[PDB]
Amino acid sequence: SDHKFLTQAVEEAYKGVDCGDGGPFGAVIVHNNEVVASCHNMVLKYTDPTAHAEVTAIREACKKLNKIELSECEIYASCEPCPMCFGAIHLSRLKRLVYGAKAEAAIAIGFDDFIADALRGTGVYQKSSLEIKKADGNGAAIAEQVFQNTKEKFRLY
Amino acid sequence: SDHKFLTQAVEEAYKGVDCGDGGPFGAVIVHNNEVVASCHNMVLKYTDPTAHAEVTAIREACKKLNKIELSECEIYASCEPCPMCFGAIHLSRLKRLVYGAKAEAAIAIGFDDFIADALRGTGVYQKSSLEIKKADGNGAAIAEQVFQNTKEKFRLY
Ligand SMILES: O=c1[nH]c(=O)c2ncn([C@@H]3O[C@H](CO)[C@@H](O)[C@H]3O)c2[nH]1
Ligand SMILES: [Zn+2]
Ligand SMILES: [Zn+2]
């Protein structure tokens, strides 16, 4: 089922960058095969630099479930969560994170080299509680190609 | 000027605890001596674990200035911002952060050992360039006293 929800997050990234809500980033929060929230980056729509896909999904899932913790839930991110979003994932008590593309795939088309030390295990103070799965194979390929596809779409604009 | 806005952030922390909005944390965003946002933790009121004082303040300042970057603004946090909030401060491009109490003051009364490497200078993948001032003297005194005064008066999260 990992493939299904990761590809749904990828679809959310495409949808969000097509409708102009924000950058090509998606996030899906699931509760035992049940989709709780399916969101993308809403920074431009909300005029909110904290409205990344992961943060938006956390907010919507927490409001839908009437609780500030998502201990029974897992999050699927189309792209490797940033430091802010990884911190939000920690605070949300999500029990597992699956992300598709490395941050370098986003950096390749002009996004900031804003990478979470706690996700990559390079910190002194911050460590991760979280089970972190980096996607491989076909899901990883789809997620990685997201960014070059979006650049192609808007090339002649 | 630093002491005034840090004191206002401390006051926001106290007000938020008294309201039941969240924990004893405040944040004030300033543009050239004008207060752009004055917020406290809203986790309990919004059912939103991302609604820390700093994130709430960034949201409100961005909505008031109707822009997603706060390049000429400064932020005053009653307590050392967590990894999430420091990532949000990074993304909002705030040029200066003044914080009152070290994170250990909050950790000592039950909060997560959840510390931002990039703030303390131990980040590797997260490279922050904003100016960071840790309060001294009376500011540090009142900011630390926040956590002694608010013990047992709010629900942890
Ligand atoms: O930056 C923060 N803003 C808050 O509102 C807040 N509320 C609680 N905490 C927790 O306090 C500790 C010290 O930063 C960390 O465990 C935070 O998650 C907060 N950190
Ligand atoms: Zn993010
Ligand atoms: Zn925080």
Coordinates of all heavy atoms in Angstrom, one line a residue, chain A residues 90-91, chain B residues 23-26 40-43 51-54 79-83 85-86 103-104 106-107 111-115 147 157, ligand 1:
Chain A
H90 N 7.5 15.3 13.8 CA 7.9 14.9 15.2 C 6.8 15.3 16.2 O 6.4 14.5 17.0 CB 9.3 15.4 15.6 CG 9.6 15.3 17.0 ND1 10.4 14.4 17.5 CD2 9.2 16.1 18.1 CE1 10.5 14.5 18.9 NE2 9.8 15.6 19.2
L91 N 6.4 16.6 16.2 CA 5.5 17.1 17.1 C 4.1 16.4 17.0 O 3.4 16.3 18.0 CB 5.3 18.6 17.0 CG 6.5 19.4 17.5 CD1 6.5 20.8 16.8 CD2 6.6 19.5 19.0
Chain B
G23 N 0.6 26.2 25.6 CA 1.7 26.2 26.6 C 2.2 27.6 26.7 O 1.8 28.6 26.0
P24 N 3.1 27.8 27.7 CA 3.7 29.1 28.0 C 4.8 29.5 27.0 O 6.0 29.6 27.3 CB 4.3 28.9 29.4 CG 4.7 27.4 29.4 CD 3.6 26.7 28.6
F25 N 4.3 29.9 25.8 CA 5.2 30.3 24.8 C 4.6 31.5 24.0 O 3.4 31.5 23.7 CB 5.5 29.2 23.8 CG 6.1 28.0 24.5 CD1 5.3 27.0 25.1 CD2 7.5 27.8 24.5 CE1 5.9 25.9 25.7 CE2 8.1 26.7 25.1 CZ 7.3 25.8 25.7
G26 N 5.4 32.6 23.8 CA 5.0 33.7 23.1 C 6.0 34.1 22.0 O 7.2 33.7 22.0
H40 N 0.7 33.8 21.0 CA 1.2 32.7 21.9 C 0.9 31.4 21.3 O 0.2 31.3 20.2 CB 0.6 32.9 23.3 CG -0.9 33.1 23.2 ND1 -1.5 34.3 23.4 CD2 -1.9 32.2 23.1 CE1 -2.8 34.2 23.4 NE2 -3.1 33.0 23.2
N41 N 1.3 30.3 22.0 CA 1.0 29.0 21.5 C -0.5 28.7 21.5 O -1.2 29.1 22.4 CB 1.7 28.0 22.5 CG 1.5 26.5 22.1 OD1 0.4 26.0 22.2 ND2 2.5 25.9 21.5
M42 N -1.0 28.2 20.3 CA -2.4 27.9 20.1 C -2.7 26.5 19.8 O -3.7 26.1 19.2 CB -2.9 28.8 18.9 CG -2.6 30.3 19.1 SD -3.6 31.0 20.4 CE -5.1 31.3 19.6
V43 N -1.8 25.6 20.3 CA -2.0 24.1 20.0 C -3.3 23.6 20.5 O -4.0 22.9 19.8 CB -0.8 23.3 20.6 CG1 -1.1 21.8 20.5 CG2 0.5 23.7 19.9
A51 N 0.8 24.7 15.7 CA 0.4 26.0 16.1 C 1.3 26.5 17.3 O 0.7 27.1 18.2 CB -1.1 26.1 16.4
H52 N 2.6 26.4 17.2 CA 3.4 27.0 18.2 C 3.4 28.5 18.1 O 2.8 29.1 17.1 CB 4.9 26.5 18.0 CG 5.2 25.1 18.5 ND1 6.4 24.6 18.7 CD2 4.3 24.2 18.9 CE1 6.4 23.4 19.2 NE2 5.1 23.1 19.4
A53 N 3.9 29.2 19.1 CA 3.8 30.6 19.1 C 4.5 31.2 17.9 O 4.0 32.2 17.3 CB 4.5 31.2 20.4
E54 N 5.7 30.7 17.6 CA 6.5 31.3 16.5 C 5.8 31.1 15.1 O 5.7 32.0 14.3 CB 7.9 30.7 16.4 CG 8.7 31.0 17.7 CD 8.4 30.1 18.9 OE1 7.3 29.5 18.9 OE2 9.3 29.9 19.8
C79 N 10.8 31.7 24.4 CA 11.7 30.5 24.6 C 12.3 30.1 23.3 O 11.8 30.4 22.2 CB 10.9 29.3 25.2 SG 11.8 27.8 25.3
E80 N 13.5 29.5 23.4 CA 14.3 29.1 22.3 C 13.4 28.3 21.3 O 12.8 27.3 21.7 CB 15.5 28.2 22.7 CG 16.3 27.6 21.6 CD 17.4 26.6 22.1 OE1 17.8 26.8 23.3 OE2 17.8 25.7 21.4
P81 N 13.3 28.7 20.0 CA 12.5 28.0 19.1 C 12.9 26.6 18.8 O 14.1 26.3 18.7 CB 12.6 28.9 17.8 CG 12.9 30.2 18.3 CD 13.8 30.0 19.5
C82 N 11.9 25.7 18.7 CA 12.1 24.3 18.4 C 12.6 24.1 16.9 O 12.6 25.0 16.2 CB 10.9 23.5 18.7 SG 9.6 23.7 17.5
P83 N 13.0 22.9 16.6 CA 13.4 22.6 15.1 C 12.3 23.1 14.1 O 12.6 23.7 13.1 CB 13.6 21.1 15.1 CG 14.1 20.8 16.5 CD 13.4 21.7 17.4
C85 N 9.9 25.4 14.5 CA 9.7 26.8 14.5 C 11.0 27.5 13.9 O 10.9 28.6 13.2 CB 9.4 27.3 15.9 SG 7.8 27.0 16.4
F86 N 12.2 27.0 14.2 CA 13.4 27.5 13.6 C 13.4 27.3 12.1 O 13.8 28.2 11.3 CB 14.6 27.0 14.2 CG 15.8 27.8 14.0 CD1 16.0 29.1 14.5 CD2 16.9 27.3 13.2 CE1 17.1 29.8 14.3 CE2 18.0 28.1 12.9 CZ 18.1 29.3 13.5
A103 N 16.1 26.2 25.8 CA 15.1 25.2 25.6 C 15.1 24.3 26.9 O 14.0 23.6 27.2 CB 15.4 24.3 24.4
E104 N 16.2 24.2 27.6 CA 16.2 23.4 28.8 C 15.2 23.8 29.9 O 14.7 23.0 30.6 CB 17.6 23.3 29.4 CG 18.6 22.5 28.6 CD 19.2 23.3 27.4 OE1 18.8 24.4 27.2 OE2 20.1 22.7 26.7
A106 N 12.2 24.8 29.3 CA 10.9 24.2 29.0 C 11.0 22.6 29.1 O 10.1 22.0 29.6 CB 10.5 24.5 27.5
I107 N 12.2 22.1 28.8 CA 12.4 20.6 29.0 C 12.3 20.2 30.4 O 11.8 19.1 30.8 CB 13.7 20.2 28.3 CG1 13.7 20.3 26.8 CG2 14.0 18.7 28.7 CD1 15.0 20.5 26.2
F111 N 8.5 19.2 28.7 CA 8.4 19.2 27.2 C 9.5 18.4 26.6 O 10.5 18.1 27.3 CB 8.4 20.7 26.7 CG 7.1 21.4 26.8 CD1 6.9 22.4 27.7 CD2 6.1 21.0 25.9 CE1 5.6 23.0 27.7 CE2 4.9 21.6 25.9 CZ 4.6 22.6 26.8
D112 N 9.3 18.1 25.4 CA 10.3 17.2 24.6 C 11.7 17.8 24.6 O 11.9 19.0 24.5 CB 9.8 17.0 23.2 CG 8.7 16.0 23.1 OD1 8.2 15.5 24.1 OD2 8.3 15.7 21.9
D113 N 12.7 16.9 24.7 CA 14.0 17.3 24.4 C 14.1 17.3 22.9 O 14.5 16.4 22.2 CB 15.0 16.3 25.0 CG 16.5 16.7 24.8 OD1 16.7 17.7 24.1 OD2 17.4 16.0 25.3
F114 N 13.7 18.5 22.3 CA 13.5 18.7 20.9 C 14.2 20.1 20.6 O 13.6 21.1 20.7 CB 12.0 18.8 20.7 CG 11.5 18.9 19.2 CD1 12.1 18.1 18.2 CD2 10.5 19.8 18.8 CE1 11.7 18.2 16.9 CE2 10.1 19.9 17.5 CZ 10.7 19.1 16.6
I115 N 15.5 20.0 20.2 CA 16.3 21.2 20.1 C 16.8 21.3 18.7 O 17.2 20.3 18.1 CB 17.5 21.0 21.1 CG1 17.0 21.0 22.6 CG2 18.5 22.2 21.0 CD1 18.0 20.8 23.6
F147 N 8.6 29.6 33.1 CA 8.4 28.2 33.3 C 8.2 27.8 34.8 O 7.5 26.8 35.1 CB 9.5 27.4 32.7 CG 9.5 27.6 31.2 CD1 10.4 28.5 30.6 CD2 8.6 26.9 30.3 CE1 10.5 28.6 29.2 CE2 8.7 27.1 29.0 CZ 9.6 27.9 28.4
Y157 N 1.8 18.9 26.0 CA 1.5 18.5 24.6 C 2.7 18.2 23.8 O 2.7 17.6 22.8 CB 0.6 19.5 23.9 CG 1.2 20.9 23.9 CD1 2.1 21.4 23.0 CD2 0.9 21.8 25.0 CE1 2.6 22.6 23.0 CE2 1.4 23.1 25.0 CZ 2.3 23.5 24.0 OH 2.8 24.7 24.1
Ligands
LIG1 O1 9.3 26.7 19.7 C1 8.4 26.4 20.3 N1 7.1 27.1 20.3 C2 6.0 26.7 21.1 O2 5.0 27.3 21.1 C3 6.2 25.4 22.0 N2 5.3 24.8 22.8 C4 6.0 23.7 23.3 N3 7.2 23.7 22.8 C5 8.2 22.6 23.2 O3 9.1 23.2 24.1 C6 10.4 22.5 24.0 C7 11.5 23.6 23.9 O4 11.5 24.2 22.6 C8 10.3 21.6 22.8 O5 10.0 20.3 23.2 C9 9.1 22.2 22.0 O6 8.4 21.2 21.2 C10 7.4 24.7 22.0 N4 8.5 25.2 21.2

